[PDB]
Amino acid sequence: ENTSENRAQVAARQHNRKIVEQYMHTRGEARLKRHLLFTEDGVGGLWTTDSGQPIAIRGREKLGEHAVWSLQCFPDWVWTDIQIFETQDPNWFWVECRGEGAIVFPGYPRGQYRNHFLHSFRFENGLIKEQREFMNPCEQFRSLGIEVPEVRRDGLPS
Amino acid sequence: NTSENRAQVAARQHNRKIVEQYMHTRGEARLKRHLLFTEDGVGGLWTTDSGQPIAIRGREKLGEHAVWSLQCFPDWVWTDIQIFETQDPNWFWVECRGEGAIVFPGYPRGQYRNHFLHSFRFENGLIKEQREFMNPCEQFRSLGIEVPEVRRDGLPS
Ligand SMILES: O=C(O)c1cc(Br)ccc1N[C@H]1CCC[C@@H](C(=O)O)C1
Ligand SMILES: O=C(O)c1cc(Br)ccc1N[C@H]1CCC[C@@H](C(=O)O)C1
């Protein structure tokens, strides 16, 4: 039904989608201003780590400061194969994508990193309140020359 | 309010019920979870230490796989289940937790807990493709496997 309230939900979803698109296409020195897409208290970061705990970057300013490090350590990064999923919540989206680029972490050799990613984006007032990255840390270990632990699944049917 | 749209709404509602039922399947009922899939339906684990998915292809293979899964994760429960519909009536995402004993050949019995994302795509009201995404490091830990620590030298606080 075409009511003011359904219309408002559609408008919000449409706006938020454009910000997801923008986020996912932000490259190069533009990454130094990606933080401006977030609420002042917005959070971003990596939810799949070797320690099992997220690394959460809290606050728009902290995200901007973080961008300096990310641009250093992933100097040519691009997201590819981007699929945006709207949800029943006009303020929540998921993205499935791939990503590739050099990885330049001090203490490791320079390497090439490729992974499969899921990102979660939650909005408030048309800015991102929470972004979260989910990936397979093992592919990052590979890129850094770190030996990947192996699980044997004996008896797993074929 | 158009038949195209009434059809999609119905398909999405039907498919959501199937996602709910999959997520709440426990115990011996797991031996029949494969009945939720198309005959050629695929399920499995998309985040593995090898970097390649472990795909289980076909309804019959998924039922055979259930035997293994019930032995290796004998009391498994999904919890904190959040179901995301999408613009596609035939594609859902689930974010949840899961926990239970892990009992793999050649590793000490453990307690495995993880955070999960599942993707479910549908055809003809049955699951055509289910994919699990988790952090393999938590599964290493549950099996007593040492996990390396990545150092992020510049990383601000
Ligand atoms: O992979 C990490 O070590 C990582 C650590 C924190 Br903490 C946050 C995010 C992380 N993932 C990267 C992957 C490459 C692009 C990059 C970006 O888009 O800023 C983010
Ligand atoms: O974690 C694995 O080793 C794994 C291997 C393949 Br092959 C497929 C799925 C896997 N994940 C489990 C996690 C516990 C519940 C279980 C189930 O719901 O059947 C599936």
Automatic annotation (TrEMBL), chain A:
Transmembrane segments: none annotated. GO terms for biological process: antibiotic biosynthetic process. It comes from the Bacteria. The keyword Cell wall biogenesis/degradation does not apply. Signal peptide: none annotated. Gene3D superfamilies: 3.10.450.50. Residues 1-13 are annotated as: Disordered. Pfam families: PHZA_PHZB (PF03284). Keywords: Antibiotic biosynthesis. Belongs to the PhzA/PhzB family. This is Phenazine biosynthesis protein A/B.
